[PDB]
Design a binder for these strands. Sequence first.
RNA 1: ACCUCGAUGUCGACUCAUCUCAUCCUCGAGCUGAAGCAGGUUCGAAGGGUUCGGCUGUUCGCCGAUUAAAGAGAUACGUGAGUUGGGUUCAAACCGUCGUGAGACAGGUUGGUCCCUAUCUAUUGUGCCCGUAGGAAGAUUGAAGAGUGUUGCUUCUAGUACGAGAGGACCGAAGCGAGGACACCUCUUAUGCUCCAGUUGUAGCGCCAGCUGCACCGCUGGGUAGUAACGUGUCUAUUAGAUAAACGCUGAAAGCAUCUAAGUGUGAAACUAUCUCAAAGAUUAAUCUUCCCAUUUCGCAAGAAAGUAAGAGCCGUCAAAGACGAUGACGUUGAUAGGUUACAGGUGUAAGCAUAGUGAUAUGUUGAGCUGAGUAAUACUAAUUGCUCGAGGACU
RNA 2: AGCGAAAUUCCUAGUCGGGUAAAUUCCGUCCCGCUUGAAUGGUGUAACCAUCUCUUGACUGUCUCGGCUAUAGACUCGGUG
RNA 3: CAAGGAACUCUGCAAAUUAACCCCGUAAGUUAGCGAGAAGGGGUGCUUAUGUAAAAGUAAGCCGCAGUGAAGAACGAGGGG
Lengths: 56, 229, 5, 122, 115, 119
Amino acid sequence: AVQQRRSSKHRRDKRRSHDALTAQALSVCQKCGKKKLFHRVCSCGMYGDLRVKKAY
Amino acid sequence: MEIRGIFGVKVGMSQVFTTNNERLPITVIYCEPNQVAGVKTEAKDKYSATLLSFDTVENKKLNKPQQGFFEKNNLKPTKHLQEIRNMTGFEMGQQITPQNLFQVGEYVDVSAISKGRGFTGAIKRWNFKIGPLGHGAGYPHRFQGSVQAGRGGASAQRVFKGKKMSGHYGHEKVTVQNLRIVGFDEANMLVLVSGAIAGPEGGVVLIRTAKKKPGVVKPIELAVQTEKA
Amino acid sequence: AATVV
Amino acid sequence: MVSFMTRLNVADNTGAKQVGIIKVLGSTRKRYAFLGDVVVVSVKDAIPSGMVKKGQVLRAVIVRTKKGQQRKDGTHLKFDDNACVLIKEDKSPRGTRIFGPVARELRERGYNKILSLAVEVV
Amino acid sequence: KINKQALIDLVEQKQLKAYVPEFSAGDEVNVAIKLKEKEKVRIQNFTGTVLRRRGKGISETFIVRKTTDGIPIEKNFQIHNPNISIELKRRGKVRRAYISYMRERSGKAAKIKER
Amino acid sequence: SYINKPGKTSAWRVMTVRQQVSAVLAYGKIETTLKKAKNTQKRLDKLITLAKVDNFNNRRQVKKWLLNTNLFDVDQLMDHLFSKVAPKYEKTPGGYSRVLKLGPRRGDATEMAILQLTD
RNA sequence: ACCUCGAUGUCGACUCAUCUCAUCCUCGAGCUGAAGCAGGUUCGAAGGGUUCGGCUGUUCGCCGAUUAAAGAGAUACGUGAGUUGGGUUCAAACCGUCGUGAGACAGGUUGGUCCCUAUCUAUUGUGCCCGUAGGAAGAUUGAAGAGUGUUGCUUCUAGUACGAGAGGACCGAAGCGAGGACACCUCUUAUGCUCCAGUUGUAGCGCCAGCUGCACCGCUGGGUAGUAACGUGUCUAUUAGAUAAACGCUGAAAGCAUCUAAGUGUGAAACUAUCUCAAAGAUUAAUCUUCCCAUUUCGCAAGAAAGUAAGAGCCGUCAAAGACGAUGACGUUGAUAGGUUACAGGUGUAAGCAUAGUGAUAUGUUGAGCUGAGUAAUACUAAUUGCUCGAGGACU
RNA sequence: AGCGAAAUUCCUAGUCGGGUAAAUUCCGUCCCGCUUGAAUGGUGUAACCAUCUCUUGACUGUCUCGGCUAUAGACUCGGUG
RNA sequence: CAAGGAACUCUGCAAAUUAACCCCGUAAGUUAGCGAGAAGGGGUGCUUAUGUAAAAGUAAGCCGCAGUGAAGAACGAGGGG
């Protein structure tokens, strides 16, 4: 089956009215000058205290 | 009616024998004492009811409004609050046990939230019939069935309201009435009731006076083990 | 299909 | 378990050996005959000598079911075959001798002859 | 609140008998049941062989099989049940906790006794 | 539809857990997805807690999961497991491996995670 | 011959039905050519149900057996963007007939493709946002609603009322059933692809042994938890109010009579509630309770730049939930997940060793070893020493 | 001549018998064969048929009657579209 | 995939057994070639002894519910056009 009457910009806009991306929480590592995620480790390799991954 | 209600948690179901050589299935409910929280009087709120609470938890993690309400009403800090309609004759701050509401074998009814199932199909939900499996089936061979009420605007072109259809199943409070009570345990604080009880283990279970035969008893005796070593 | 007769 | 178009052996010897179900009594759409459920039956395989032939339609009581049933007491009875006995219209069976065991539940249906001429009731 | 699920066994200890012996899968046993046609009680004798043994409490049940006039008979017995007498007569050796091949074997369908 | 790939089965996952536990025993740090790390963590902990017996029965039973690696073959990694991995972890009950979460991948933006041991 | 040929897809079967009553049954009543059982007829009544098979493609029809019955119709002679193609009917061919011929036949036969990923609407669910002159947390009432409402058999009343003999109760009570529904895995089974044991071929771990990969989970016999029925529990009532058909009292109009005009009533699976479920988005935005707020104060005098401290959200480990989202429990002051220990269940005597045996192998060590979910303890691992929204209660 | 309600038959669900509990199908006979029929051949025929039709033994989720598991989709997310 | 076993349904359409080797036994009918693998049954694992070059065969013993243990091998009968 196909659509009978053309859906104008109004229909597509009201349909995409709820599709926006929500921001992901961020946190600052204690010895890493970066704005990293929450509960994650950034590119320098510290979750804080314990180290885990290479420098880069 | 002068209904009597109490709360507990379904912990598991096991069978116990009785006289007359009969086998009975029984569910076991942990009956933590409930504490009355309010009396909905016919004079103030225009409906008689009794509000109780249960599942006491540490006060620190409990929220602020409930903590303040319990502090002002001088009650046990609890986790669940719920009321029962048309229950009277109890003062504020009272102890409730199932051994001063019921008899040995009087009829009761039990309610609990139905165990969930996920998004189910039509046939499994409304007990429909699976169509043919041989001689050609098409790309569907398990589905709702005809929803037609007619073709053309003279009688149809709208799907009838509330027709049995695929959707959510379970997670809705259902009730089965006319259950005989069998076992009381004030030493271990448990109730053993015949039949089967809806709802998974670990949920809320409500035992009330059956709306069909209130205050109707029948004697049931626990069977005794004669053959000893 | 076809042939509505 | 036991339902429409089922062939089974005959526990007594009125002349028949294999018997087929034609319908099951009770309300409409019974679709399941338990132990002691009167059933309209037809004869399919039978020995020549006897008081029955091949073609007649009779009424029968099932005494053996392979699936069995959970009794009210709690014990469960099972079988490895299916056996039936024949009656004319009354509870008295036409058979002269009943071979094999018979379920106790039949006490709750009458048919005292079935109990009376049983080798041993389970 | 908090539980241990031993309450299942706690509401259980009111209906056990302590005179039942051990018998696993292939032993020749006898069981008697009290039948009430009237206040006169009759003692049904039921010989047979072990077919299965499984349970977690009062659910512990076993199976008894006998043969008469060429016809075999099966029965389920609840281990914990009033008016039920359980005794052991012969012990054998089998390698399966539950034996299913017996249902299609009659005639030299017997188990060598234990050594 | 039809003949399209068998995909993930019991065989594939049992390989994935076996090979990943072999690799982590060889080196000690594995890059995977979080939900695969969760799957392999159970087998990792079971194997390493069974390792501490040091007898031929468990030495036989552990062969059901281990497999060779690029730097060490089956036998040397087996001997190493009880030489310095097993006798090192005995005073702490279980829970020897940890999973940490990374950022999304570049290609498929899937969740990457480090699985590692802990002294 | 009015709408359709710039296409409106035509029978029956299957599933799913819904509606009317001119009732197939259950229900109430009158009359009787109603002795009583069993009937005939008419009125009132749509809550529920109204069978399974053989023949034929079949509706219909005939037949067989049941039951309470196997209702009459409608919805594009219900429904092919939910299935089928058995046929009319496409191209092939045949038998009979007509035709001097290609060919045709309400004459019949054998074989013969059923397309479509869902926009709007409507529906079943499940959500985001916003709103109810403060916010949040709960607990409530109920405006309008939805579903459930089917009955049989045997016994006592009693071989009594009735009849004469055959025959045989109404009215009620008790016990057990079928159909449908709500649930639930104690028992019984089915399933149970990281469970157990046995087992063939084959390539490996170098060979013995023991394991690994593969051959539909390789096969076979069992089987945790979960989910299911063939399994077990209950629901199928009771009664209230107003009524149809009908049944009355008193009572004149119309001195009688009369159920009606006034009055006072009896009266059924129908109707409102009595059962179950949801529900204040019921904007006509309802009720109660507890908790929270107070940093002067300016520009186009608007209460403005500071926007909780109540809580909620971001993110995380999960399932009693679950397509996603939600919902629910917990986030180092912790038992939510993982591991470990202990235990339950299953399986059935791990491996090695010792002995008997020339050898398949047998006994003891052993009811031993093993185990995804099962039950609980335990900070060892995972949930950070994080981030955002979020108050001055408008007037009378 | 032969065959015969046969792929031919309108009345037709012709009659009867066999087969079934119960048969517009099937088999055998009866023939007012509306229109059978002799090289547009008629009758019987051993073997064979991815031919059609009827009966039947085992056989089974075709069904009484539905359920579970595994995947790959469908469903969420990332890239293209 | 319990029990029933074609009751499904336009009709057993689809789906289930039977397979390999070896050893027994085989009709009505016929053009005497066949029908025929007709139908219907038994054994198959391991070790030892005997037996030939190995098998086959036999016996004795052993285990498992099951032994071409897995993988690939013909469902059959009766009647008609």
